[PDB]
Amino acid sequence: MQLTPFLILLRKTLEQLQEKDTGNIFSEPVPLSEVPDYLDHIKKPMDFFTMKQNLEAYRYLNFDDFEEDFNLIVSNCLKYNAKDTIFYRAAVRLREQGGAVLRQARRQAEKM
């Protein structure tokens, strides 16, 4: 498999995932200024801006490593926030809508 078409696919997939995050609540790292306790139990924060930087640093060389960091965005949010919050439900919705995006992208990758 060739590297450039694969990264082109990951770039498109990342854009499709960001489109599902309409509030842009996962676009950038969680502000530790407003959430000073966030690192107490979130051992690896993740967000789409960080994912873009990892992508361009050639840190995602297979679909699973890309998908793992997306799942981290979701799982961090479910962990930190109470179930009755907008944040928690936004993570549920992203898990649902992003899973469909990821399944189609992986089918495209496996054709390579």
Ligand X SMILES: C[C@@H]1Nc2ccccc2NC1=O
Q: Long-range contacts made by residues 35-43, C-beta under 8 angstroms, separation at least 24?
A: 35/80, 38/80, 41/79, 41/80, 42/76, 42/79, 42/80
Give me the residues that bind ligand X (CB under 6 A), please. 25-26, 30-31, 34-35, 77, 80-81, 87
Q: How far is the CB of 6 from ligand X (least distance, A)?
A: 28
Q: How far is the CB of 81 from ligand X (least distance, A)?
A: 5
Q: State which residue, 6 or 21, has the beta carbon closest to ligand X.
A: 21
Q: How far is the CB of 102 from ligand X (least distance, A)?
A: 19
- Give dist(CA 87, CA 40) in Å, integer: 18
